[PDB]
Structure formats: C-alpha cells, structure tokens
Design a protein around this motif. Structure first.
Motif, PDB file in Angstrom:
ATOM      1  N   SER A 129      50.501  65.656  73.347  1.00 12.25           N
ATOM      2  CA  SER A 129      51.529  64.786  73.850  1.00 12.25           C
ATOM      3  C   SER A 129      51.452  63.383  73.298  1.00 12.25           C
ATOM      4  O   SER A 129      52.436  62.772  72.937  1.00 12.25           O
ATOM      5  CB  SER A 129      51.446  64.729  75.368  1.00 12.25           C
ATOM      6  N   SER A 130      50.246  62.885  73.209  1.00  7.97           N
ATOM      7  CA  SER A 130      50.044  61.534  72.748  1.00  7.97           C
ATOM      8  C   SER A 130      50.291  61.432  71.251  1.00  7.97           C
ATOM      9  O   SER A 130      50.761  60.408  70.767  1.00  7.97           O
ATOM     10  CB  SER A 130      48.653  61.013  73.187  1.00  7.97           C
ATOM     11  N   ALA A 131      49.928  62.470  70.514  1.00  4.59           N
ATOM     12  CA  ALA A 131      50.188  62.458  69.088  1.00  4.59           C
ATOM     13  C   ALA A 131      51.720  62.459  68.886  1.00  4.59           C
ATOM     14  O   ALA A 131      52.288  61.674  68.106  1.00  4.59           O
ATOM     15  CB  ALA A 131      49.533  63.619  68.403  1.00  4.59           C
ATOM     16  N   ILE A 132      52.404  63.279  69.667  1.00  2.19           N
ATOM     17  CA  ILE A 132      53.842  63.325  69.560  1.00  2.19           C
ATOM     18  C   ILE A 132      54.526  62.002  69.959  1.00  2.19           C
ATOM     19  O   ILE A 132      55.354  61.448  69.211  1.00  2.19           O
ATOM     20  CB  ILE A 132      54.368  64.488  70.439  1.00  2.19           C
ATOM     21  N   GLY A 133      54.085  61.416  71.062  1.00  3.55           N
ATOM     22  CA  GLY A 133      54.569  60.111  71.444  1.00  3.55           C
ATOM     23  C   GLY A 133      54.305  59.080  70.362  1.00  3.55           C
ATOM     24  O   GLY A 133      55.195  58.317  70.017  1.00  3.55           O
ATOM     25  N   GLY A 134      53.117  59.108  69.764  1.00  4.34           N
ATOM     26  CA  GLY A 134      52.753  58.156  68.731  1.00  4.34           C
ATOM     27  C   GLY A 134      53.700  58.200  67.556  1.00  4.34           C
ATOM     28  O   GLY A 134      54.204  57.157  67.101  1.00  4.34           O
ATOM     29  N   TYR A 135      53.981  59.416  67.090  1.00  6.23           N
ATOM     30  CA  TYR A 135      54.933  59.611  65.992  1.00  6.23           C
ATOM     31  C   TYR A 135      56.281  58.996  66.334  1.00  6.23           C
ATOM     32  O   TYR A 135      56.765  58.092  65.634  1.00  6.23           O
ATOM     33  CB  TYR A 135      55.096  61.106  65.688  1.00  6.23           C
ATOM     34  N   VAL A 136      56.829  59.382  67.476  1.00  2.00           N
ATOM     35  CA  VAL A 136      58.160  58.891  67.801  1.00  2.00           C
ATOM     36  C   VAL A 136      58.184  57.371  67.993  1.00  2.00           C
ATOM     37  O   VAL A 136      59.103  56.705  67.505  1.00  2.00           O
ATOM     38  CB  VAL A 136      58.756  59.596  69.072  1.00  2.00           C
ATOM     39  N   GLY A 137      57.184  56.822  68.670  1.00  2.21           N
ATOM     40  CA  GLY A 137      57.125  55.393  68.897  1.00  2.21           C
ATOM     41  C   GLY A 137      57.136  54.604  67.603  1.00  2.21           C
ATOM     42  O   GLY A 137      57.858  53.591  67.467  1.00  2.21           O
ATOM     43  N   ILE A 138      56.310  55.034  66.649  1.00  2.00           N
ATOM     44  CA  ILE A 138      56.211  54.276  65.412  1.00  2.00           C
ATOM     45  C   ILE A 138      57.449  54.410  64.540  1.00  2.00           C
ATOM     46  O   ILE A 138      57.875  53.448  63.884  1.00  2.00           O
ATOM     47  CB  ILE A 138      54.931  54.622  64.634  1.00  2.00           C
ATOM     48  N   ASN A 139      58.083  55.570  64.606  1.00  2.00           N
ATOM     49  CA  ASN A 139      59.320  55.726  63.879  1.00  2.00           C
ATOM     50  C   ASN A 139      60.447  54.923  64.484  1.00  2.00           C
ATOM     51  O   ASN A 139      61.267  54.361  63.761  1.00  2.00           O
ATOM     52  CB  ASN A 139      59.667  57.194  63.681  1.00  2.00           C
ATOM     53  N   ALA A 140      60.482  54.857  65.807  1.00  4.31           N
ATOM     54  CA  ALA A 140      61.414  53.969  66.489  1.00  4.31           C
ATOM     55  C   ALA A 140      61.211  52.489  66.112  1.00  4.31           C
ATOM     56  O   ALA A 140      62.178  51.762  65.844  1.00  4.31           O
ATOM     57  CB  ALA A 140      61.318  54.164  68.001  1.00  4.31           C
ATOM     58  N   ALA A 141      59.956  52.064  66.026  1.00  8.90           N
ATOM     59  CA  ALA A 141      59.687  50.696  65.622  1.00  8.90           C
ATOM     60  C   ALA A 141      60.155  50.450  64.198  1.00  8.90           C
ATOM     61  O   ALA A 141      60.813  49.439  63.927  1.00  8.90           O
ATOM     62  CB  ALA A 141      58.181  50.365  65.766  1.00  8.90           C
ATOM     63  N   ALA A 142      59.903  51.428  63.329  1.00 10.85           N
ATOM     64  CA  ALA A 142      60.325  51.349  61.941  1.00 10.85           C
ATOM     65  C   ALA A 142      61.837  51.256  61.828  1.00 10.85           C
ATOM     66  O   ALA A 142      62.344  50.456  61.059  1.00 10.85           O
ATOM     67  CB  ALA A 142      59.805  52.542  61.163  1.00 10.85           C
TER      68      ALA A 142
END
Ligand code: NI
Length: 227
Positions: free
Chosen positions: A138-151
């Motif tokens: 879950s955290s790996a998945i959240g991490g991916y989405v969060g950083i792509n959103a920031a990008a």
C-alpha cells in the motif's frame, strides 16, 4: 522536480507561498496539539532522510530534475502534517544553504513536494489499506502516486509560464516550454524510473520498520498503552 530561480514569475511565486502558508500553519497546530519532547527528533530525522534521498537526482530536458522524495514514507510513519513540516524544513535548508531550488520558489516546491506528495500518497495508502492490501504494498503504491502527482503539479506550473507570462513579442519571460513539452518530460521521468525508486524505498523502509516492531517481544505488551 525542484524549480530553480527565474522559472516562475514573482506573481506565481507569491501565489504558491500564499497557498502554502495556511498548510504549514495548520500542520504546526496539529503538531502543536500532539507534543512529547520526542516527536520533534523524529521530524528532524525524517527531514534529514528525505533531504539525503533528494540529493540523488537527474536533469529532465524540458522539465527540471527527477529524484525520489520519501514523502509518503514520512506521511505514513509520522502522519502527513508532521511529514509536511519535516519536508518543508528540508527544502528550506536546501534553498538557504545549497542553492538547490529557488528561494522565491519555496512556496511552489513545498506546495508540490511538502503538501501534494505526502497528502496524496497518504490518501492512496489509506485507500489501499481499505482495499485490504498490506501496508508495505500500500505504501509503495501511495508513494508512486504521490510523487507523480507532485511531478504533475510541477509540470503544470512550469508549462503554464509561457502561456501566462510573455513579452509583447510572444517571447516567454520565464520558463519557455508549454504544457505539450513540460507534461510529457516531467511525467515520463516520474512515471517510469523515479516513481519506481520512490515505491521501492518507501516499501523497503516500511517493511523494515514492520518487522523490527513485529519482534522485540516487549512490543506486544506495550503497544496498547501507546498514549
Ligand atoms: Ni526536485
């Protein structure tokens, strides 16, 4: 993704600072509501960890740079408010002391990396938890989405510059590339390599923290007393 000096108009810079001010204000109060002497040290360590991570980055032609953040990792471990403070603090240090990220750009990068990334990442994390996925996954998945959103947020901010701020000659005054350039550059970098790195790092540390608790038998008695 850190935006350097001169990429955003003073007006854009001003806007992001004004948007970022209430965020940090709220985070502080939330943190202020919940103190032991000790969670302050926690914030600092996280902050130092994130800072270190971010130091490993590559230029994105047509965008800025790419690197991982550890943002969702921080939100999931400290709560997102504390993470945002931790993260803002690291960018501030980068800006004042390293010339890394513009000083006038402090509002924007924090909006991106200290607000959007950890809050989005945390939300996806909670969502995946509600779908009954383990915390690591879950955290790996959240991490991916969060950083792509920031990008994405970064890419939209840069890409809007030539549209909004130009000379009477049609000449861009700041960042010179549009959404057509900026979105693909930033998102391709972050959707492929950097996001994978973020996910793996977030998951790795969570896994590691998971089983460290999971043992020292002491833990099983004292975790219901954590007050
Ligand atoms: Ni950056």
């Amino acid at each position: 993704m850190h935006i350097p000096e001169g990429y955003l108009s003073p007006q854009t810079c001003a806007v992001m600072g004004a948007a970022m001010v209430p965020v940090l204000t709220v985070a502080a109060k939330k943190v202020n509501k919940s103190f032991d002497k000790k969670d302050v040290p926690a914030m600092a360590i996280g902050s130092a960890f994130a800072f270190t991570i971010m130091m490993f980055n590559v230029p994105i032609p047509g965008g800025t740079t790419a690197h991982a953040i550890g943002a969702t990792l921080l939100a999931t471990t400290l709560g997102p408010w504390a993470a945002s403070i931790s993260l803002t603090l690291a960018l501030f240090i980068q800006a004042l002391l390293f010339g890394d990220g513009g000083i006038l750009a402090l509002g924007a990068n924090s909006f991106n990396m200290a607000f959007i990334a950890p809050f989005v990442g945390y939300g996806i994390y909670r969502l995946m938890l509600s779908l009954k996925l383990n915390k690591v996954l879950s955290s790996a998945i959240g991490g991916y989405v969060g950083i792509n959103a920031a990008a994405l947020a970064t890419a939209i901010e840069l890409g809007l510059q030539p549209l909004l701020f130009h000379t009477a000659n049609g000449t861009p005054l700041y960042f010179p590339y549009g959404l057509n350039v900026a979105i693909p550059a930033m998102m391709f970098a972050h959707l492929t390599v950097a996001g994978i790195v973020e996910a793996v790092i977030t998951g790795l540390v969570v896994y590691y923290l998971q089983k460290v608790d999971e043992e020292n038998i002491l833990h099983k008695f004292s975790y219901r007393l954590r007050g």
